[PDB]
Amino acid sequence: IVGGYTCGANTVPYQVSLNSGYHFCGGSLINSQWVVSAAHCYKSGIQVRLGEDNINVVEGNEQFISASKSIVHPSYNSNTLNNDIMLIKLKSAASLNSRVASISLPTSCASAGTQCLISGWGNTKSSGTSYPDVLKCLKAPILSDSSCKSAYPGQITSNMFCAGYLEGGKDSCQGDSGGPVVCSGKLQGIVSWGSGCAQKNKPGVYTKVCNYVSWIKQTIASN
């Protein structure tokens, strides 16, 4: 997260870290056994780490659970990043409580101008590389469709939206992929891609989760 602030421990209890001997993507706990992340984060041997704040120190509220299954959307396209969503089943259910909790799926898509919270352990520098220890948060508006398509001509599908600032200076960055964009207590987006991080007129692009609510429900129902 570039231009964000330290969230505070336990303040984003649905945020997970995907770990393979290092943090490589975030995700969101949507119920005690399932996490939503980005399809481009897929890899074998994922350990899901719940209740984290400092990802380098065991501080107390952590739960490390191996992924049992990673269901990448069958129409994910790695070139266009269309349908960039993956469900992860946990080997074992999480212990839900204060410090660890699920986030609700939306029943409706969000309007332009809605304020959202984006969080993650990604890079905090636009030109450089500085990875935080602790979770970083950032408030950002969903931008209009026309501004999103003007920023990325030919590249925005129905399953995407842009959020952030056209002035630059505040954005999600590498390491934040697969994490949550929460608006009004509902998961509306998944961190997916962009041209760099926090660049002028190149806002972050996000997977539009309201287009996937039936897919998520039916898949979870089947596995």
Binding site: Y22, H23, F24, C25, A38, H40, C41, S78, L81, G122, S172, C173, Q174, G175, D176, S177, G178, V191, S192, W193, G194, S195, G196, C197, G204
Partner: peptide, 9 residues
Amino acid sequence: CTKSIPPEC
């Protein structure tokens, strides 16, 4: 680029 570590550009 995707925002994964490492990025996929």
